[PDB]
């Protein structure tokens, strides 16, 4: 792809994080802690899952960023509406305001309803995410495999400002402690 020139500098919003997450000083990395991280509760925090939003809000234009997923067993990545539900149980779908892909149990899937199987020959260590607000497109790229396309959501109905979306996943296995990292431009 040739989307690299739309690169944006994403930082994580500490106030939206699940209370078990640990965000680095530079706000560019996030991992699952082994306990509650001693923060107060607020209406922004994702309560049920290890999720956090980017600070940046997008309502126009073309945006591109990259995320490092090295050695993780499970994660979700993409964008979501600013007004997504924070509390309780929900599914990641465009009807609920999410445009996402994930890794789970050794398979990659796009967060459609129902979910769509992805076809990845080279397990990615870094993911590229491209949003074209006006066109209604969210695309995912395999940086490890020379930028090959993973998935395109088209005909997106954003219906609001968008935020970068992250889920570091649970670590029930002891094999999913590694962080998500925003990669340098
Ligand atoms: C890009 O490849 C990966 O991230 C793979 C996917 C999954 O099989 C876990 N994994 C590891 O490499 C890993 C987990 C713990 C130590 O290494």
Swiss-Prot record:
Induction: Up-regulated by IFN. Residues 8-185 form the B30.2/SPRY domain. Autoubiquitinated; does not lead to its proteasomal degradation. Deubiquitinated by USP4; leading to its stabilization. Autoubiquitinated. It is found in: Cytoplasm; Cytoplasmic vesicle, Autophagosome; Nucleus; Cytoplasm, P-body. E3 ubiquitin-protein ligase whose activity is dependent on E2 enzymes, UBE2D1, UBE2D2, UBE2E1 and UBE2E2. Forms a ubiquitin ligase complex in cooperation with the E2 UBE2D2 that is used not only for the ubiquitination of USP4 and IKBKB but also for its self-ubiquitination. Component of cullin-RING-based SCF (SKP1-CUL1-F-box protein) E3 ubiquitin-protein ligase complexes such as SCF(SKP2)-like complexes. A TRIM21-containing SCF(SKP2)-like complex is shown to mediate ubiquitination of CDKN1B ('Thr-187' phosphorylated-form), thereby promoting its degradation by the proteasome. Belongs to the TRIM/RBCC family. Homotrimer. Component of a SCF(SKP2)-like complex containing CUL1, SKP1, TRIM21 and SKP2. Interacts with CALR, CUL1, FBXW11, HSPA5, IKBKB, IRF3, SKP1 and VCP. Interacts with SKP2; the interaction with SKP2 does not depend on an intact F-box domain. Interacts (via N-terminus and C-terminus) with DCP2 (via N-terminus and C-terminus). Interacts (via C-terminus) with IRF8 (via C-terminus). Interacts with ULK1, BECN1 and with ATG8 family members, including GABARAP, GABARAPL1, GABARAPL2 and MAP1LC3C/LC3C. Interacts with TRIM21 and SQSTM1/sequestosome 1. Interacts with IRF3. The coiled-coil is necessary for the cytoplasmic localization. This is E3 ubiquitin-protein ligase TRIM21. The chain holds residues 291 to 468 of 470 of the full protein.
């Amino acid at each position: 792809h040739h989307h690299h020139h739309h690169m944006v500098h994403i930082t994580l919003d500490r106030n939206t994080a699940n209370s078990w997450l640990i965000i680095s000083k530079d706000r560019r990395q996030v991992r699952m802690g082994d306990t509650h991280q001693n923060v107060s509760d607020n209406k922004e925090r994702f309560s049920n899952y290890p999720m956090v939003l980017g600070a940046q809000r997008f309502s126009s234009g073309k945006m591109y960023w990259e995320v490092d997923v090295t050695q993780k067993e499970a994660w979700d990545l993409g964008v979501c509406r600013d007004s997504v539900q924070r509390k309780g149980q929900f599914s990641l779908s465009p009807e609920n305001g999410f445009w996402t892909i994930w890794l789970w149990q050794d398979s990659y899937e796009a967060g459609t309803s129902p979910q769509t199987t992805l076809h990845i020959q080279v397990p990615p260590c870094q993911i590229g995410i491209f949003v074209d607000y006006e066109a209604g497109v969210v695309s995912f790229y395999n940086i490890t495999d020379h930028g090959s396309l993973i998935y395109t959501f088209s005909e997106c109905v954003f219906a609001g400002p968008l935020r970068p979306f992250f889920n570091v996943g649970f670590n029930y296995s002891g094999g999913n402690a590694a962080p998500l990292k925003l990669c340098p431009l």
